[PDB]
Amino acid sequence: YVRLDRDRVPTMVGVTRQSRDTITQPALSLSTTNTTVGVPLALDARAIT
Amino acid sequence: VLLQRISPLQIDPTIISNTMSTVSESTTQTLSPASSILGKLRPSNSDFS
Amino acid sequence: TVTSPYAPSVNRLMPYRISNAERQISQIIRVMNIGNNATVIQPVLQDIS
């Protein structure tokens, strides 16, 4: 969790499931092979109030 | 049609349907990417001439 | 508060201990197959409620 620091706000979360073309190391193949994960949710501001 | 009968490659949009089945969107928000993706790719049409 | 007895016994099998790697791998799999769904989140996020 981050209060007011833009340099420390999460942007995306991704999960990979395979190597990309030929490289073996996951630390090298993870950058351009993952899949963004996340959905929004709508609440009731007046109900919370 | 000669190439259709020759080629071993058989086309099946159920791959797209199965990949996008896990993607769904909340009951509150109106606009949805995956529904538009399915409706615009039309994976139930078998005319690939 | 739970109570465990203190005495000699008949040996018993309780296979319920797993490692952090086994926990985290399955957690990654669960995130992979739950992400972008927003329709399995709702039952969980309402059962917790």
Q: Do A41 and B25 touch (CB under 8 A)?
A: no
Structural biology method used: cryo-EM
Shortest distance between the Cα of C7 and any Cα of chain A, in A, equals 48
Q: Is A45 an interface residue toward B (CB < 8 Å)?
A: no
Q: How far apart are CA A21 and CA A12, in angstroms?
A: 23
Q: How far apart are CA C19 and CA A47, in angstroms?
A: 42
CA angle B25, B26, B30 (to 5 degrees): 85
The secondary structure of chain C as a DSSP string is ------S------------HHHHHHHHHHHHHHHTT-SSSHHHHHHH--
Q: Do C31 and A37 touch (CB under 8 A)?
A: yes
Q: What is the resolution of this structure in A?
A: 3.4
Q: Do C38 and B24 touch (CB under 8 A)?
A: yes
